[model samples]
Target: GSSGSSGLVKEIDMLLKEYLLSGDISEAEHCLKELEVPHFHHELVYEAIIMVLESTGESTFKMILDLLKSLWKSSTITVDQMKRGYERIYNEIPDINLDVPHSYSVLERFVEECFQAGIISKQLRDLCPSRSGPSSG
Candidate 1:
């Protein structure tokens, strides 16, 4: 396992929980700053994406997206870390799908939205699983 204080791990969960409860962007950023671990910020991206996968509310999805955009727009999280977050999610989808059966499809949606929000890149978006349909655009 990566070496770090366990308390910081819990702090990320608390940050997402509070954001989920209040959808308060400023407070979420405040709590994130309290972590003082910019290098490990990708963990926040990982946890936040997983949190949304486990929860099934459209509002929940919107809030998480907003938080991500705010974080990226403010340069609070780096693009490399964001891509690392998505890469980790892509790798975990098989296992995550065991728990969240619809995770693959849901992740497809999440990845597309992240791309649209400019929080993630087109190259990263293409890394997602292919859509199970024929389409032309």
Candidate 2:
């Protein structure tokens, strides 16, 4: 909670809707610098996106990659953000069918790719994964 959070929410509300209808996250992302998106708020979108992924496939992977890529193509991601991101996926399960291999964990496998790519903060990985893992994996 800091300066302009309310205003940021208002702006993001409009911007998110614009993307939902117009399908141009580029415009919403343009306004990204003006706001500090809270972790729970990002979870809201992740839950929805995962729903589509449950029934579908790799398009889901690419979608999340784009989000991390936009944050910082070079610098390490915020560890707190990474923590929240991991928790959101690990804590919640989508109604759609997950098409992951049985040998691997569902959300963990997805995160692994991003982790290996070196986008996540090393600190997030440093922390042990929580006990309350996801339903599928």
lDDT of each: 0.82, 0.48
Sum up the clashes in candidate 2. 0
Candidate 1: regions farther than 4 A off: 1-6, 131-137
Which lDDT value does model 2 have at 134? 53
How well does each candidate superpose onto the true structure, as a TM-score? Answer: 0.87, 0.49
Best by lDDT: 1
Candidate 2 has which clashing residue pairs, if any?
none
In model 1, where is the ten-residue run with the lowest total lDDT?
128-137
Q: Give the TM-score of candidate 2.
A: 0.49
What tens digits encode model 1's per-residue C-alpha lDDT throughout 1-137? 75666565777888899898887888899889877888778888888888778899878778887888898888798899898888888888778878897677777888888898888898778887554644456
Clashes of each: 0, 0
- Which candidate tops TM-score? 1
Expressed as tens digits, the lDDT of each residue in 16-101 for candidate 2 is: 44544564546546555445555334543344335334534555456545555555452323555455755555444332224433
Which residue ranges in model 2 land beyond 4 Å of their true spot?
Answer: 1-25, 34-52, 74-77, 94-105, 121-137
